[PDB]
RNA sequence: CGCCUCCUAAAAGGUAACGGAGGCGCCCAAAGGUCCCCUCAGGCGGGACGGAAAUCCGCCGGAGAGCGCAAGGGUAGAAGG
RNA sequence: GGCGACACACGUGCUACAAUGCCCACUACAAAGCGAUGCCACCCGGCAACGGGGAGCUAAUCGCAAAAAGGUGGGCCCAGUUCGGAUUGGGGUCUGCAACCCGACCCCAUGAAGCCGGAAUCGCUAGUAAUCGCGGAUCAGCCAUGCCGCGGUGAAUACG
RNA sequence: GGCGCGUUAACAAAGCGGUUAUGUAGCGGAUUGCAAAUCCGUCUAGUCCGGUUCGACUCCGGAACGCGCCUCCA
């Protein structure tokens, strides 16, 4: 495992504040990050084209990971979509690639967001997990306006071993998650 | 997002390019270039990022732009909406605000014509 | 154009003066 | 009677094309007066002239008291004016008729 | 606008009625005709019956409407739409 | 990780316009951002921009009070 | 008018009526063999476009899903992916 | 308070859709009128609208006054744009007792529809049509892009 | 009662498992002294109930109404 700026910050500064603020007796009771799972629910390339191959190309430039295709569980007429069409891209980030992703997410990407008023403090799982969406891909550093060709955002899932929202609210904010209210 | 959260057209003049951003008219187009020591009549395809960030820092600090402009005006009309002032009514129903006639035109304010039978 | 009040000819058309057509 | 809904039968009288036009003047007059009474109107039978009038119009006035109010209109209404159809500028005397009928029961028939 | 180097206009038979009542321990419903009047902080709180040509409209006044006139909030054109 | 499919990560030097520099890892060895965390208005406290308001409407106009008592 | 499923059928099998209800006259080159891996429907909360329902995360959920097509039986300790 | 409304429909015009053009700087050439709670020179504060001063003129004398297209030079490069100027927000000026309904003008931002217009249809035969700017009446101010005028530049075509 | 066919918008009437039918009318415009004719445009849908299907005006079953045929020898 390599030195990751946010990884250090978790261990040196976030760990003891949580123990302090919550009082766990066991070094494993203190909440952690489990994984970050990114999902572009593209669904436009249902039949229109093979535009996914470019989005998996960019999602790999952002996370360092080639994502996997998601396909339609059933068939939907109104969505103009049959069962089994490639309709999205999921990538699962763990360990360092998870850290390295959020480090850039919080430091440069969430700032470079247009008209940013902070993350919604109400998007917590109800069981200690958090989810936020996005509208673009140039928000992330590695995506230039030259290479862009379509405006595709994503959903972001951050999973924590915290049992409650309040334990997870503290864990994320102590890492650098700008919460609106 | 070159400046103010918007990429600005290349192969164009830097005063014209700044107009290609929400909140920068021709009067503000020149204001920076003189007050930033920046040659107005040259491409964006030949600019150092010293001038660029000098230009970017100038316009994003001095001037309410892109998002903040849009939201602020968006809030101002809303106050007239809330209180029940005449301009607030005429902002709801899509009628004019500045006292124009309505018997005929206003089509910009009222979209394409809703032709009627009878 | 003669309606663009922010120009020389626009102010000419309206016959008024300002930053764009001064006296 | 007085409280039930009403059917109004407007028919062009002597006058030809101008009687039919006047019939439409009588027609619009009643539809408006219905509004200024909280009454609901609905057209059941309309026979327009290509000039804008009606050789016959039949409409209901729905609302408590329609036959109470509209009943005083059943008769012949005379117009005296210079018709839009006149070209020598003369005054013609045309007529339109109004018929006021209380709304009926579609009562079902079965054998005793 | 009425140019600022003049006095911000109030018909001054009305601003009287709003500060003569700040003394008296208000508040009343004051019926007016000077729609042409800028709202002042001395009016915030009262009820004024801004005429509109036919009827007296109760127009309470709040703290988001100071610069605006009394006659804005008493329109005169009943519309409802068309159709 | 599977070979041949993933864009290899190298130590990166992202760069904001404000001279802020971030020791991270990325697909590019250097990027040049224009906004960052260290200078974002929402981030650097309030850092209230040109909106140091007070509204400043409208009772606060106080552009008069000459009107008599 | 032949064939299949259920009931009638009286707890083995069988059992009729111009009795009550459905279906078949195909299909699949994988929808076949084997080895390996995997587990549903649905409910709640959460998440840009994105909705009742597209894809993503969490929790609950033994089978009510799925098994090409009727019905029944069978079935996730797989026959399902 | 309304005559200024607005699901709609028609007439008369304005402004456009651009390169024979737009923009900016600089330099030209008219006529007819108006002008004493009036024209306003000139100067200062003002990006400006204007505000402060302040000559001359009862006016072939003083002023409105810049005429404008044009001429020269420079810029925009075919892009719903250095076309277009609608809509709206905000900040001001002026008149007038009073600018909400409902005025006009300036400044900042906003930059819409519109790529030359279906069936159809109007004007004009020469200094005319086209285009260009200027004045006046009414008038506190102005919703005038209207009307009555004024000159600048200046064609095409008429077999029949 | 049996058997066959049908129900679509203002009317008449079609195709279709995914889709401005069409004609006439009606509606806005043109033209005309005006109306018609004509010209430029434009437009409202699938009888109810229940199934199949990703999806039903369209397929299956029933109802309701309408049409057509038959009801003979005892
Ligand atoms: Mg411990
Ligand atoms: Mg919550
Ligand atoms: Mg958790
Ligand atoms: Mg701009
Ligand atoms: Mg305004
Ligand atoms: Mg106007
Ligand atoms: Mg109006
Ligand atoms: Mg005659
Ligand atoms: Mg690695
Ligand atoms: Mg046999
Ligand atoms: Mg057989
Ligand atoms: Mg048995
Ligand atoms: Mg049995
Ligand atoms: Mg037995
Ligand atoms: Mg046996
Ligand atoms: Mg049997
Ligand atoms: Mg083979
Ligand atoms: Mg099989
Ligand atoms: Mg199988
Ligand atoms: Mg196999
Ligand atoms: Mg949900
Ligand atoms: Mg959802
Ligand atoms: Mg089952
Ligand atoms: Mg199936
Ligand atoms: Mg079946
Ligand atoms: Mg009038
Ligand atoms: Mg006009
Ligand atoms: Mg005069
Ligand atoms: Mg003049
Ligand atoms: Mg545009
Ligand atoms: Mg367009
Ligand atoms: Mg322009
Ligand atoms: Mg007004
Ligand atoms: Mg433009
Ligand atoms: Mg072009
Ligand atoms: Mg033409
Ligand atoms: Mg002649
Ligand atoms: Mg011209
Ligand atoms: Mg005048
Ligand atoms: Mg004039
Ligand atoms: Mg029968
Ligand atoms: Mg049919
Ligand atoms: Mg029919
Ligand atoms: Mg046919
Ligand atoms: Mg057929
Ligand atoms: Mg048709
Ligand atoms: Mg037609
Ligand atoms: Mg027609
Ligand atoms: Mg139906
Ligand atoms: Mg169905
Ligand atoms: Mg169905
Ligand atoms: Mg359908
Ligand atoms: Mg049907
Ligand atoms: Mg059927
Ligand atoms: Mg016989
Ligand atoms: Zn920075």
mmCIF file of C-alpha atoms (C1' of nucleotides) in Angstrom, chain A residues 35 39 41-44 70-73 79 123 125 127 131 134 153-155, chain G residues 41-42 45-60 81:
data_model
loop_
_atom_site.group_PDB
_atom_site.id
_atom_site.type_symbol
_atom_site.label_atom_id
_atom_site.label_comp_id
_atom_site.label_asym_id
_atom_site.label_seq_id
_atom_site.Cartn_x
_atom_site.Cartn_y
_atom_site.Cartn_z
ATOM 1 C CA UNK A 35 -15.744 0.667 -0.880
ATOM 2 C CA UNK A 39 -22.389 3.821 -11.558
ATOM 3 C CA UNK A 41 -26.771 4.710 -15.554
ATOM 4 C CA UNK A 42 -26.133 5.584 -19.181
ATOM 5 C CA UNK A 43 -29.129 3.913 -20.815
ATOM 6 C CA UNK A 44 -28.860 6.214 -23.830
ATOM 7 C CA UNK A 70 -24.605 -3.377 -16.608
ATOM 8 C CA UNK A 71 -27.540 -4.859 -18.495
ATOM 9 C CA UNK A 72 -31.307 -4.585 -18.339
ATOM 10 C CA UNK A 73 -32.788 -7.088 -15.894
ATOM 11 C CA UNK A 79 -37.676 2.937 -22.059
ATOM 12 C CA UNK A 123 -28.409 11.549 1.373
ATOM 13 C CA UNK A 125 -28.350 5.498 3.678
ATOM 14 C CA UNK A 127 -27.645 2.803 7.784
ATOM 15 C CA UNK A 131 -24.821 8.440 -2.063
ATOM 16 C CA UNK A 134 -23.133 14.175 -10.593
ATOM 17 C CA UNK A 153 -22.653 12.136 -15.031
ATOM 18 C CA UNK A 154 -22.905 9.321 -12.506
ATOM 19 C CA UNK A 155 -24.080 8.008 -9.144
ATOM 20 C "C1'" A G 41 -39.394 -12.180 -6.464
ATOM 21 C "C1'" G G 42 -40.679 -8.422 -3.492
ATOM 22 C "C1'" G G 45 -34.060 3.768 2.824
ATOM 23 C "C1'" G G 46 -30.298 6.003 -0.320
ATOM 24 C "C1'" G G 47 -28.491 7.908 -5.622
ATOM 25 C "C1'" A G 48 -27.502 13.150 -11.941
ATOM 26 C "C1'" C G 49 -30.519 13.002 -15.950
ATOM 27 C "C1'" G G 50 -34.036 8.508 -14.570
ATOM 28 C "C1'" G G 51 -40.062 8.251 -14.115
ATOM 29 C "C1'" A G 52 -44.330 3.002 -10.720
ATOM 30 C "C1'" A G 53 -40.568 0.462 -13.293
ATOM 31 C "C1'" A G 54 -33.704 1.275 -16.839
ATOM 32 C "C1'" U G 55 -28.709 1.019 -13.886
ATOM 33 C "C1'" C G 56 -25.917 1.629 -8.675
ATOM 34 C "C1'" C G 57 -25.532 0.974 -2.795
ATOM 35 C "C1'" G G 58 -27.476 -0.630 2.060
ATOM 36 C "C1'" C G 59 -30.889 -3.534 5.013
ATOM 37 C "C1'" C G 60 -34.872 -7.064 5.257
ATOM 38 C "C1'" G G 81 -28.383 -17.182 -13.943
#
